[PDB]
């Protein structure tokens, strides 16, 4: 899709083998914010969003948190607190043709900057001046979109690049997108290093008597620390007691 009309695919309820991506040699840009790619294998998320589009090379830099320019402002805006990956690779072989491929567009004018993950696909005539356009182009009345000039002979800066942006949903809900990391058996009444759905800690897991609701995933202490969980594989509730310690 064009950058102004970037596609969004939702990923849910599956195992994400991210090795296939970071071990592939097909990508020029693999930039992960608020996360390390390798670690992805150990992590779960409620949702993943793959935002796909095409831009020119020199604009790849605009696909990053708190960037400015035509793309970052009018086409596709990342939040300043973005937590995810940006993958980009040259697509000169596919998206360029002799004579110039103009199927790919970008928004050139807009009355305001886009909000993070805002999608504007409107074709309203931009009123550059004081005269209302009334949907009629002319002086100070321009079409908001413009084509990319993608020829095979174009400079690498102007060559087409396919971009996928992965956003990860670290929320307080059940996580359906997990890494390939295998599960193990559960041990009770012992000091253990536990990992539930990426939620790591060290404690003693005991049968709880807490009345979790059918929906409630895990519980917290006064300190906003995890005190009790629901096993992802078993609808069983466990209290976590921190491993016995004391001053000596």
């Amino acid at each position, epitope marked *: 899709a064009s950058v102004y009309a970037w596609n969004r695919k939702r990923i849910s309820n599956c195992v994400a083998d991210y090795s296939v991506l970071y071990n592939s040699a097909s990508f020029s840009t693999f930039k992960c914010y608020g996360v390390s790619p390798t670690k992805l294998n150990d992590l779960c998320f409620t949702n993943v969003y793959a935002d796909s589009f095409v831009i020119r090379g020199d604009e790849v830099r605009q696909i990053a948190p708190g960037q400015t320019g035509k793309i970052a402002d009018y086409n596709y805006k990342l939040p300043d607190d973005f937590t995810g990956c940006v993958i980009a690779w040259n697509s000169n072989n596919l998206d360029s043709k002799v004579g110039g491929n*103009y199927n790919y567009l970008y928004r050139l004018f807009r009355k305001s900057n886009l909000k993070p993950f805002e999608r504007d696909i409107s074709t309203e005539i931009y009123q550059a001046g004081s005269t209302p356009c009334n*949907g009629v*182009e002319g002086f100070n009345c*321009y079409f908001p979109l413009q*084509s990319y000039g993608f020829q095979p002979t174009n400079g690498v800066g102007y060559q087409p690049y396919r971009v996928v942006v992965l956003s990860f949903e670290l929320l307080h809900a059940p996580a359906t997108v997990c890494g390939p990391k295998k599960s193990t058996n559960l041990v009770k009444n012992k000091c253990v290093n536990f990992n539930f759905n990426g939620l790591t800690g060290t404690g003693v897991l005991t049968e709880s008597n807490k009345k979790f609701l059918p929906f409630q995933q895990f519980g917290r202490d006064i300190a906003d620390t995890t005190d009790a969980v629901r096993d992802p594989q078993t609808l069983e509730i466990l209290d976590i007691t921190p491993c016995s310690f004391g001053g000596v």
Partner: nanobody
Amino acid sequence: QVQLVESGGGLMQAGGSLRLSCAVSGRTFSTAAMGWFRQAPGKEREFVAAIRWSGGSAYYADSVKGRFTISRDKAKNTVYLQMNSLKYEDTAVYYCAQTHYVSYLLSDYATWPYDYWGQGTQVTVSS
């Protein structure tokens, strides 16, 4: 690729009016703009009128402004040139052209090299 087929050319008396048609087939979803051009015997090809596919805003050469009207029917993938107040100087072969290039600036369609061209239709204006 698109195919452009013009029709409606012929002999008309000065002061009369005539509508040319250009039917687009093939990759019709790609259409950004259509343009009409004309070539008189012994003269260079000359821009007449262009229309943006989305919105239908029109741009005209000075020689035809106020006389000619360009229109398009999206559903039928057809562009029309309504040639009112015909003059001797309008005698020429008229060509329709299509581009998938989107310019922010309508006036650029006057000079843009287009992608696909019709076969041409002869208009002859009688004294």
